[PDB]
Amino acid sequence: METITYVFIFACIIALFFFAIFFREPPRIT
Amino acid sequence: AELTPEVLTVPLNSEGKTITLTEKQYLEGKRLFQYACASCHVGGITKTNPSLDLRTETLALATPPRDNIEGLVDYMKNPTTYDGEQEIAEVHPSLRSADIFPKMRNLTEKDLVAIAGHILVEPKILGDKWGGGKVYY
Amino acid sequence: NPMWRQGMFVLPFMARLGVTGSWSGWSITGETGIDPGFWSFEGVALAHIV
Amino acid sequence: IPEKLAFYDYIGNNPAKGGLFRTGPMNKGDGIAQAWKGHAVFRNKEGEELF
Amino acid sequence: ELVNVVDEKLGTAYGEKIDLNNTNIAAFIQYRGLYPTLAKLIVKNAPYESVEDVLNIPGLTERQKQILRENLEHFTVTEVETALVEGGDRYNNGLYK
Amino acid sequence: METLKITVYIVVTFFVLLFVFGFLSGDPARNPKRKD
Amino acid sequence: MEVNQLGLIATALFVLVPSVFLIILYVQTESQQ
Amino acid sequence: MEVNQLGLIATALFVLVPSVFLIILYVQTESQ
Amino acid sequence: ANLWERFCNWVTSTDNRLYVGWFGVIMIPTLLAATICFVIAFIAAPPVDIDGIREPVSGSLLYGNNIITGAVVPSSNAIGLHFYPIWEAASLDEWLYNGGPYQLIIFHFLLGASCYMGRQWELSYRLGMRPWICVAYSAPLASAFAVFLIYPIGQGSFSDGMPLGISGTFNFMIVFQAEHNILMHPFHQLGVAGVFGGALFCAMHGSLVTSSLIRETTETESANYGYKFGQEEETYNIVAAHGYFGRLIFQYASFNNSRSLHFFLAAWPVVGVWFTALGISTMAFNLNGFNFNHSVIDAKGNVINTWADIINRANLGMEVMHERNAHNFPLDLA
Amino acid sequence: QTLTYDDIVGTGLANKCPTLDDTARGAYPIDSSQTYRIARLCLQPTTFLVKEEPKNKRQEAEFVPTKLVTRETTSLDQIQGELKVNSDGSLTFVEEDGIDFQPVTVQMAGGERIPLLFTVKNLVASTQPNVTSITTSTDFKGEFNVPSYRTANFLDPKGRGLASGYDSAIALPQAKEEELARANVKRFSLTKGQISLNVAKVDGRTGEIAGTFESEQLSDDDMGAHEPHEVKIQGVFYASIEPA
Ligand SMILES: CCCCCCCCCCCCCCCCCC(=O)OC[C@H](CO[C@@H]1O[C@H](CO[C@H]2O[C@H](CO)[C@H](O)[C@H](O)[C@H]2O)[C@H](O)[C@H](O)[C@H]1O)OC(=O)CCCCCCCCCCCCCCCCC
Ligand code: CLA
Ligand code: CLA
Ligand SMILES: CC(C)=CCC/C(C)=C/CC/C(C)=C\CC/C(C)=C/CC/C(C)=C/CC/C(C)=C/CC/C(C)=C/CC/C(C)=C\CC/C(C)=C/CC1=CC(=O)C(C)=C(C)C1=O
Ligand code: HEC
Ligand SMILES: CC1=C(/C=C/C(C)=C/C=C/C(C)=C/C=C/C=C(C)/C=C/C=C(C)/C=C/C2=C(C)CCCC2(C)C)C(C)(C)CCC1
Ligand code: OEY
Ligand SMILES: [Cl-]
Ligand SMILES: [Cl-]
CATH class of the missing domain: 2.40.160.30 (Photosystem II, cytochrome c-550 precursor)
Structure with a gap:
């Protein structure tokens, strides 16, 4: 169960990476 | 504490005669010892055969006894194994082998005494550290 | 101690259609020192992840 | 010697012997004390007491 | 019923004298005339049934027999301990300074 | 193993040549200001 | 491994409670504009 | 009692996950 | 319109969400190879005989590690500096035992990281920027080359490059101290100065700008909404920041030129960390930190200890215990 | 005619015994x-x-x-x-x-x-x-x-050995040692x-x-x-x- 927990968290971070890059608030000029 | 004549006083020979070194001789021998000897004998150990050290009690049990100026000066001329059984001038620096050990070439007779004096004095100053190894660094 | 005593649920569906051995050299028939190639239990699992 | 006083003279009740993530009661570590075993005296082959 | 044989060996004469059957070769430096030559020989020809067997080492010169007699009281023999003699450990037991 | 080795030599060579010929292809000129 | 059993529940809550709080505030923010 | 200690995490998530779902939908409703 | 030209335009296009570029063509496959092998090895690699003494060290989660103790273990000392690709092993089982994954991961990462630096130059050119961001990054990059390549080269073995794990990192830095006395090495001292100073100036600069933000908002809203992305006017008063910090110390020790100030921010930790990378890189050839062991003695010649000697007692404890079954002779010369 | 080190080195032939016709x-x-x-x-x-x-x-x-x-x-x-x-x-x-x-x-x-x-x-x-x-x-x-x-100098990963090393599980100071005798006593x-x-x-x-x-x-x-x-x-x- 510890192994599954560690990897689960690591997997959530990678998913978060995906959304923070491709699904970001797009910066808009002025 | 200081470098007093009683510490600078070491056995000359096995008879039991003594010689008192000067501070000069002591520092002369220390320097000469770093030049010709410390590469293997730093701190009174023997890096290439750690089973043999330069402690006074080890030298005392060498054959022939080496805890005195005469024995040590002799060893620097014609080194033997610890039991005296074979001459090892071919693998230990010595005046006998100064041709293959070039650092021994400019050693005079009084240099040998300064070196033997240093070896005998340093244990009186440093104690177990001399020949004790890293445990006592 | 066969698979069905250990609560294996998907292991037998792989076995059913031909996947019998592991990259670590065992097969569920008990035969040791087997080389299943890619389509071991491991590679079947890998391929579903990919 | 009352056991209670002997139990104070034991490093397992020293508060400076724990760990941040070693959780729970002290009893979960060395256990539940049951009895003082007695005061141990060491001697060598010459009968000197040793500490 | 699980003992450390080396600790058990320290409770024997091995803990107090040079064991001619077990002790590393560097111990023969504690007494004069013994190292390296006689020590080389005692070790190579171990093991001994009694201390006095070392006098029957072939090739010994009368001077050598004299040093061994001088030092018999510093030797013992106990049973060979596999753990102290395997691995060439009687010639180098991993201890330097 | 020998098949793995060939495959990697091939894959690596391919990428290294893309790299070499990509920069040989007039890289100085791909900027937003002055092209030559 | 002989591992602290409550580590699991502790980890899950540690992740879940703070995360859920942020999502609640994000979604009700988007529903305003 | 020698209970199933995975019961605690099952019960906890049984409650938290769907409750959170509801709370999230409700709060974003009240904010429009 | 030609096929190669359309490929070249897509590689160098400033319109991809992530820039590729020619450096990208090499970076992407190598960083993916290194990343994927890393992830699998960290979770599932069996134990590795790092020191070549048939004493395998378990590094992965499924072999009884946690996030803090786990690592991809360096390859075997039996291999030394020899190249050990998969196809040189009789099997993956042999390659795993001897630590093949480490080599694969480090060589691909160092390649891909090197191209990462190149990519930073490249996009800077396509966008009409000045070019030297990549120079800033050479400092971290240099640091990674030192612990994964240069130190192994000088010491003769990848078994002595830095493990890829949290506790393995600490192992590496303890053993370094024992063998090189890095703390007493000036280039490491300049690294600390570059890192401490960098964190200090980071905090300083962030607190000075933050202190001098111009009121653009109400109490009930983040001040951050007082800046709109791409506005042309500056968002703080630098003369006010200068006036406060100049008085905090004295006028002429404060910057009023924002270009000088931002260049100073860049140079201090970059240079400090170059030096610390150089520290690892030169200690790789055993030019070690200052040695003042027994430098102080008295009129008789007793040793009078200093803090250097205490440090040496600690270094000694590290020395005699590290890799406790791997030394058969009295000097640990590499 | 026979091979030299530099012909053999790195081939694996060094681990092969000589063969007979x-x-x-x-x-x-x-x-x-x-x-x-x-x-x-x-x-x-x-x-x-x-x-x-x-x-x-x-x-x-x-x-x-x-x-x-x-x-x-x-x-x-x-x-x-x-x-x-x-x-x-x-x-x-x-x-x-x-x-x-x-x-x-x-x-x-x-x-x-x-x-x-x-x-x-x-x-x-x-x-x-x-x-x-x-x-x-x-x-x-x-x-x-x-x-x-x-051999006798070998230290296990917790420092325990036969001719050297610790004689107990020093990381579990107040643990009952009977469970651990097989691992403590080499x-x-x-x-x-x-x-x-x-x-x-x-x-x-x-x-x-x-x-x-x-x-x-x-x-x-x-x-x-x-x-x-x-x-x-x-x-x-x-x-x-x-x-x-
Ligand atoms: C983010 C967006 C980016 C883009 C996305 C890209 C998506 C693609 C993602 C790739 C995902 C990679 C997944 C990891 C692959 C590693 C699998 C492996 O290594 O698995 C390989 C398996 C594993 O092999 C087995 O591996 C075992 C290893 O055991 C180990 O593993 C066991 C199982 O866990 C136990 O742990 C055991 O105790 C332990 O020792 C044994 O050694 C077996 O004998 C051995 O066969 O091998 C096989 O048969 C494989 C076939 C080899 C047969 C020989 C022919 C050579 C073929 C060359 C390969 C070509 C590669 C493709 C490139 C082509 C390009 C055009
Ligand atoms: C001052 C507060 C306080 C103190 C001193 C104690 C002390 C104690 N309690 Mg009690 N307890 C408290 C509050 C406190 N409790 C509260 C508020 C609760 C309700 C949750 C409880 C519930 C409780 C139970 C249910 C039990 C105890 C028990 C115990 C004992 C064991 C403690 C232990 O294992 O520590 C463990 C401590 C730690 C692991 C340290 C955790 C701190 C973390 C690491 C901080 C988090 C860092 C954070 C994420 C950083 C991010 C910051 C950054 C991002 C900005 C001890 C006597 C136990 C006992 O033996 O009783 C019989 C027991 O079973 N306590
Ligand atoms: C207060 C105490 C203190 C302080 C402040 C430092 C500070 C430092 N030490 Mg010293 N150290 C100390 C005590 C201290 N140390 C002690 C007590 C010892 C002996 C035990 C040492 C032993 C020691 C050693 C042995 C080493 C250091 C090193 C360093 C540096 C580490 C940071 C670094 O290298 O950045 C450099 C930057 C990097 C390494 C980053 C490279 C990043 C790459 C390029 C990219 C990574 C990508 C990543 C994998 C993926 C991210 C993507 C994301 C999506 C996940 C720094 C100057 C190291 C050093 O000088 O390195 C050269 C080093 O090797 N120290
Ligand atoms: C028995 C008897 C009677 C005895 C007699 C004894 C007696 C009585 C004594 C009494 C003494 C007495 C009465 C008092 C007088 C004593 C006195 C004058 C002593 C001096 C005291 C002293 C120790 C002071 C400490 C000095 C000190 C530590 C300062 C050093 C400053 C320093 C090194 C700072 C680094 C600054 C740096 C390099 C750059 C700036 C940092 C940085 C980049 C910031 C970012 C930044 C900067 C900007 O600038 C702006 C703009 C912006 C935007 C911005 O981001
Ligand atoms: C390494 C190259 C050495 C240098 C340089 C010096 N000595 Fe040495 N010494 C060395 C060894 C390997 C040995 C052991 C020889 C043997 O097999 O017995 C020695 C021995 C000595 C001794 C005898 C110590 C004893 O306990 O009996 C002495 C007194 C001695 N060496 C002195 C000495 C001096 C004065 C040196 C410089 C002039 C010197 N040695 C250099 C190895 C090396
Ligand atoms: C609770 C419960 C239940 C339910 C459950 C469920 C419903 C589950 C699900 C689950 C699931 C559903 C799972 C899933 C998972 C998944 C995964 C695990 C995935 C992964 C993937 C990945 C990792 C990938 C990656 C990648 C990418 C992304 C791209 C490129 C390629 C690659 C491959 C790399 C029931 C009713 C039975 C009852 C009892 C209780
Ligand atoms: O420091 Mn000590 O030295 Ca460089 O090797 Mn010799 O021992 Mn071992 O392998 Mn890793 O570690
Ligand atoms: Cl170590
Ligand atoms: Cl060695």
Whole structure:
């Protein structure tokens, strides 16, 4: 169960990476 | 504490005669010892055969006894194994082998005494550290 | 101690259609020192992840 | 010697012997004390007491 | 019923004298005339049934027999301990300074 | 193993040549200001 | 491994409670504009 | 009692996950 | 319109969400190879005989590690500096035992990281920027080359490059101290100065700008909404920041030129960390930190200890215990 | 004509024993009087088999095959010893010295690493009586010693050893030590193994011989920590004979 927990968290971070890059608030000029 | 004549006083020979070194001789021998000897004998150990050290009690049990100026000066001329059984001038620096050990070439007779004096004095100053190894660094 | 005593649920569906051995050299028939190639239990699992 | 006083003279009740993530009661570590075993005296082959 | 044989060996004469059957070769430096030559020989020809067997080492010169007699009281023999003699450990037991 | 080795030599060579010929292809000129 | 059993529940809550709080505030923010 | 200690995490998530779902939908409703 | 030209335009296009570029063509496959092998090895690699003494060290989660103790273990000392690709092993089982994954991961990462630096130059050119961001990054990059390549080269073995794990990192830095006395090495001292100073100036600069933000908002809203992305006017008063910090110390020790100030921010930790990378890189050839062991003695010649000697007692404890079954002779010369 | 180091280095040939011409079907005769030594005995293993543990009572487990993971480090070589002529004409070989051990770890199916000290230490190997010639049907049989895989200075990962190291589990200071005696108290095993050497090729001019060997011995017990496995080693050998 510890192994599954560690990897689960690591997997959530990678998913978060995906959304923070491709699904970001797009910066808009002025 | 200081470098007093009683510490600078070491056995000359096995008879039991003594010689008192000067501070000069002591520092002369220390320097000469770093030049010709410390590469293997730093701190009174023997890096290439750690089973043999330069402690006074080890030298005392060498054959022939080496805890005195005469024995040590002799060893620097014609080194033997610890039991005296074979001459090892071919693998230990010595005046006998100064041709293959070039650092021994400019050693005079009084240099040998300064070196033997240093070896005998340093244990009186440093104690177990001399020949004790890293445990006592 | 066969698979069905250990609560294996998907292991037998792989076995059913031909996947019998592991990259670590065992097969569920008990035969040791087997080389299943890619389509071991491991590679079947890998391929579903990919 | 009352056991209670002997139990104070034991490093397992020293508060400076724990760990941040070693959780729970002290009893979960060395256990539940049951009895003082007695005061141990060491001697060598010459009968000197040793500490 | 699980003992450390080396600790058990320290409770024997091995803990107090040079064991001619077990002790590393560097111990023969504690007494004069013994190292390296006689020590080389005692070790190579171990093991001994009694201390006095070392006098029957072939090739010994009368001077050598004299040093061994001088030092018999510093030797013992106990049973060979596999753990102290395997691995060439009687010639180098991993201890330097 | 020998098949793995060939495959990697091939894959690596391919990428290294893309790299070499990509920069040989007039890289100085791909900027937003002055092209030559 | 002989591992602290409550580590699991502790980890899950540690992740879940703070995360859920942020999502609640994000979604009700988007529903305003 | 020698209970199933995975019961605690099952019960906890049984409650938290769907409750959170509801709370999230409700709060974003009240904010429009 | 030609096929190669359309490929070249897509590689160098400033319109991809992530820039590729020619450096990208090499970076992407190598960083993916290194990343994927890393992830699998960290979770599932069996134990590795790092020191070549048939004493395998378990590094992965499924072999009884946690996030803090786990690592991809360096390859075997039996291999030394020899190249050990998969196809040189009789099997993956042999390659795993001897630590093949480490080599694969480090060589691909160092390649891909090197191209990462190149990519930073490249996009800077396509966008009409000045070019030297990549120079800033050479400092971290240099640091990674030192612990994964240069130190192994000088010491003769990848078994002595830095493990890829949290506790393995600490192992590496303890053993370094024992063998090189890095703390007493000036280039490491300049690294600390570059890192401490960098964190200090980071905090300083962030607190000075933050202190001098111009009121653009109400109490009930983040001040951050007082800046709109791409506005042309500056968002703080630098003369006010200068006036406060100049008085905090004295006028002429404060910057009023924002270009000088931002260049100073860049140079201090970059240079400090170059030096610390150089520290690892030169200690790789055993030019070690200052040695003042027994430098102080008295009129008789007793040793009078200093803090250097205490440090040496600690270094000694590290020395005699590290890799406790791997030394058969009295000097640990590499 | 022979090879030099620089021809061999890095090929793996260094781990291979010398071979005899497939033409070498001769005989090497034994002067009951004159004496003989073996100047080089070389043993190259090719196959490593481990006995399984069959859980039940009457199944007797198989010898299963294993993958070597320690590479081309397996061969014994430069072995030498007396070769004696006995009263009844049997020959006995007495090992004296040589590189007569190699640590090996093979891997079983499922991932278990099995280490062993492949050795012929202290080998004594005899033939049938009334030999009078070594031929392509001579068989040597004998037994040897298998010391502990680690020697007495070896420290386990918590610093515990036999001739060195801690005598307890210092990280569990107030734990009950009875559970841990097997792991705290190291033991130096010393077992015997058996070997068959089958001569199949014989150069009557040069005194070289070669053939096949099968050896049985125990694996590593980790200084008492766990029970050993039985191992069977098959390979090929090469020896050279000289009048002493
Ligand atoms: C983010 C967006 C980016 C883009 C996305 C890209 C998506 C693609 C993602 C790739 C995902 C990669 C997944 C990891 C692959 C590693 C699998 C492996 O290594 O698995 C490989 C398997 C594993 O092999 C087995 O591996 C085992 C390893 O055991 C180990 O593993 C066991 C199982 O866990 C136990 O742990 C055991 O104890 C332990 O020792 C044994 O050694 C077996 O004998 C051995 O066969 O091998 C096989 O048969 C494989 C076939 C090899 C046969 C030989 C032919 C050579 C073929 C060359 C390969 C070509 C590669 C493709 C490139 C082509 C380009 C055009
Ligand atoms: C001052 C507060 C306080 C103190 C001193 C204690 C002390 C104690 N309690 Mg009690 N307890 C408290 C509050 C406190 N409790 C509260 C508020 C609760 C309700 C949750 C409880 C519930 C409780 C139970 C249910 C039990 C105890 C028990 C115990 C004992 C064991 C403690 C232990 O294992 O520590 C463990 C401590 C730690 C592991 C340290 C955790 C701190 C973390 C690491 C900080 C988090 C860092 C954070 C994420 C950083 C991010 C910051 C950054 C991002 C900005 C001890 C006597 C136990 C006992 O033996 O009783 C019989 C027991 O079973 N306590
Ligand atoms: C207060 C105490 C203190 C302080 C402040 C430092 C500070 C430092 N030490 Mg010293 N150290 C100390 C005590 C201290 N140390 C002690 C007590 C010892 C002996 C035990 C040492 C032993 C020691 C050693 C042995 C080493 C250091 C090193 C360093 C540096 C580490 C940071 C670095 O290298 O950045 C450099 C930057 C990097 C390494 C980053 C490279 C990043 C790459 C390029 C990219 C990574 C990508 C990543 C994998 C993926 C991210 C993507 C994301 C999506 C996940 C720094 C100057 C190291 C050094 O000088 O390195 C050269 C080093 O090797 N120290
Ligand atoms: C018995 C008897 C009676 C005895 C007699 C004893 C007696 C009585 C004594 C009494 C003494 C007495 C009465 C008092 C007088 C004593 C006195 C004058 C002593 C001096 C005291 C002293 C120790 C002071 C400490 C000095 C000190 C530590 C300062 C050093 C400053 C320093 C090194 C700072 C680094 C600055 C740096 C390099 C750059 C700036 C940092 C940085 C980049 C910031 C970012 C930044 C900067 C900007 O600038 C702006 C703009 C912006 C935007 C911005 O981002
Ligand atoms: C390494 C190259 C050495 C240098 C340089 C010097 N000595 Fe040495 N010494 C060395 C060894 C290997 C040995 C052991 C020789 C043996 O097999 O017995 C020695 C021994 C000595 C001794 C005898 C110590 C004893 O306990 O009996 C002495 C007194 C000695 N060496 C002195 C000495 C001096 C004065 C040196 C410089 C001139 C010197 N040695 C250099 C190795 C090396
Ligand atoms: C609770 C419960 C239940 C339910 C459950 C469920 C419903 C589950 C699900 C789950 C699931 C559903 C799972 C999933 C998982 C998944 C995964 C795990 C995935 C992964 C993937 C990945 C990792 C990928 C990656 C990648 C990418 C992304 C791209 C490129 C390629 C690659 C491959 C790399 C029931 C009713 C039974 C009852 C009891 C209780
Ligand atoms: O420091 Mn100590 O030195 Ca460089 O090797 Mn010799 O021992 Mn070992 O392998 Mn890693 O570690
Ligand atoms: Cl270590
Ligand atoms: Cl060594």
